[PDB]
Amino acid sequence: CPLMVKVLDAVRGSPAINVAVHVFRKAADDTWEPFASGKTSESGELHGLTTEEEFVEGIYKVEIDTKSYWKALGISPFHEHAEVVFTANDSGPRRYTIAALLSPYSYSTTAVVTN
Amino acid sequence: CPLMVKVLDAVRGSPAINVAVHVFRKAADDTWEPFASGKTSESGELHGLTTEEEFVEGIYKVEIDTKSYWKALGISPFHEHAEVVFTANDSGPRRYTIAALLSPYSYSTTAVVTNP
Amino acid sequence: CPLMVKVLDAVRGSPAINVAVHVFRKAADDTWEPFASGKTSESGELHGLTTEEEFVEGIYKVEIDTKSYWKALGISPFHEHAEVVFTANDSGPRRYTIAALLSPYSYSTTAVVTNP
Amino acid sequence: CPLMVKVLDAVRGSPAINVAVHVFRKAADDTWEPFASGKTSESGELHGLTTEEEFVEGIYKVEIDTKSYWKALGISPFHEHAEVVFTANDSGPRRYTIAALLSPYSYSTTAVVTN
Ligand SMILES: Nc1cccc2c(S(=O)(=O)O)cccc12
Numbered sequence: 001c002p003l004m005v006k007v008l009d010a011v012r013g014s015p016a017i018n019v020a021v022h023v024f025r026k027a028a029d030d031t032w033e034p035f036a037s038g039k040t041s042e043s044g045e046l047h048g049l050t051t052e053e054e055f056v057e058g059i060y061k062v063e064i065d066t067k068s069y070w071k072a073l074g075i076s077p078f079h080e081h082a083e084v085v086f087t088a089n090d091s092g093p094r095r096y097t098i099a100a101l102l103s104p105y106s107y108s109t110t111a112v113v114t115n
Numbered sequence: 116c117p118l119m120v121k122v123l124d125a126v127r128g129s130p131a132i133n134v135a136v137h138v139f140r141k142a143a144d145d146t147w148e149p150f151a152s153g154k155t156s157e158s159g160e161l162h163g164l165t166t167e168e169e170f171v172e173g174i175y176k177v178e179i180d181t182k183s184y185w186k187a188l189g190i191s192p193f194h195e196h197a198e199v200v201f202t203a204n205d206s207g208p209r210r211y212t213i214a215a216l217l218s219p220y221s222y223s224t225t226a227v228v229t230n231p
Numbered sequence: 232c233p234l235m236v237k238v239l240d241a242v243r244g245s246p247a248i249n250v251a252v253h254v255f256r257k258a259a260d261d262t263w264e265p266f267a268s269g270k271t272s273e274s275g276e277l278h279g280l281t282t283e284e285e286f287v288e289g290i291y292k293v294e295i296d297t298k299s300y301w302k303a304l305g306i307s308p309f310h311e312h313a314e315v316v317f318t319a320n321d322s323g324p325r326r327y328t329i330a331a332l333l334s335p336y337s338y339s340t341t342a343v344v345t346n347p
Numbered sequence: 348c349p350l351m352v353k354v355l356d357a358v359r360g361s362p363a364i365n366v367a368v369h370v371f372r373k374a375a376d377d378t379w380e381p382f383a384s385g386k387t388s389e390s391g392e393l394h395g396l397t398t399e400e401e402f403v404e405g406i407y408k409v410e411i412d413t414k415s416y417w418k419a420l421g422i423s424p425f426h427e428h429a430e431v432v433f434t435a436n437d438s439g440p441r442r443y444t445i446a447a448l449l450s451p452y453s454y455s456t457t458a459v460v461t462n
């Protein structure tokens with residue numbers, strides 16, 4: 001698992017469950033091309049998005065569908081989505097965890113890059 | 116001033132100065148059109164991006180050029196930029212402050228929305 | 232103003248108004264002595280806690296009464312308060328802004344330290 | 348494991364390793380009484396601080412020794428420590444994870460309360 005996503009809900013102090021995540025790779029013509037997607041699990045986690053063979057160096061965007069999440073909980077949110085854009089590298093450590101903490105009018109995102 | 120941006124640097128405990136910021140508005144045809152741009156001042160603030168008249172309802176993208184900023188300080192950051200996407204003025208005119216806190220491998224962004 | 236506090240509410244996208252704040256200073260005998268206190272205004276800011284003269288070198292604790300704040304809004308938060316502990320003025324007089332961002336189960340705090 | 352701590356380093360995008368953590372319980376006389384302590388592991392995690400039988404309802408303080416961490420990395424930090432104070436409850440979900448993200452002049456902390 002080269003690329004994992006974990007989402008927390010700062011209002012409820014819980015994993016953010018069933019949040020849609022879409023990942024895009026930047027194409028030579030500078031458009032965003034769908035790459036991977038899924039929904040966070042009961043633990044707020046999304047694994048198995050890609051494989052080591054497919055996850056080549058490149059610029060990637062992870063789009064977290066936060067608006068839909070809040071709407072489903074009946075809470076009025078500010079953002080359309082959270083949007084994490086980064087270069088995936090071959091000589092940084094190998095596993096990328098994109099973590100995201102969600103509030104209605106705020107979010108943070110952290111990259112955890114390890115062996 | 117209906118749209119302002121304030122950036123702090125979490126490594127130095129200071130405003131983040133000279134941070135480039137590009138603002139886009141989603142057009143009818145669903146492309147991002149350039150809307151406004153600027154750079155944060157020595158107080159880490161960016162004012163005067165737009166006017167009440169020009170800042171109509173729509174979906175806006177505020178792109179904070181975090182990688183350029185860290186690289187100018189000799190840090191290799193994780194993110195290309197922070198991307199703040201939101202609907203604005205759907206319930207009438209509001210004033211928005213987009214606040215961002217920057218670390219090399221992390222950032223947060225908070226919106227303060229007030230009714231003038 | 233050498234010590235100021237600014238609080239935002241991450242649920243409402245607004246300044247956090249009427250947030251109680253208590254400041255302590257570690258005494259020679261290692262107890263926390265009361266130093267200053269106040270409440271954030273409608274802009275979520277708290278000024279005038281202390282003076283340049285009284286704000287000497289030492290270890291300070293800024294206690295932001297987050298539980299009282301959320302409870303007054305009918306939210307049951309996780310934390311009793313946010314506790315910001317730091318050495319101040321060890322390299323001469325500085326000006327400190329303690330910024331805090333509040334969610335019911337999360338908070339962050341950032342220091343902006345400038346040399347006047 | 349009723350109480351776990353996980354610490355991340357926002358400068359390096361890594362677990363914060365070997366960070367001392369001291370936990371205190373508030374006594375009837377309102378002083379803080381040592382309760383548990385340890386150092387984060389290679390994954391930035393600290394488990395086995397307490398047991399379900401010992402972790403009674405009460406006010407607890409988790410003190411994260413952030414100053415020492417930064418000092419060891421040669422980076423000048425603002426805080427003496429990060430300080431997470433909370434009431435432990437019997438009818439909230441059972442497992443508490445105190446998460447903390449560290450920067451030299453900033454930190455955030457999040458409570459993840461689950462089954
Ligand atoms: N993370 C933050 C918390 C509280 C306030 C913040 C501000 S501001 O209040 O100075 O506009 C700016 C950037 C980040 C902040």
Ligand SMILES: Nc1cccc2c(S(=O)(=O)O)cccc12
Nearest residue numbers: 008099100101108446447448457
């Ligand atoms: N698993 C996690 C550990 C430590 C911090 C985390 C954050 S945070 O940095 O925004 O608070 C967000 C999501 C997961 C985290």
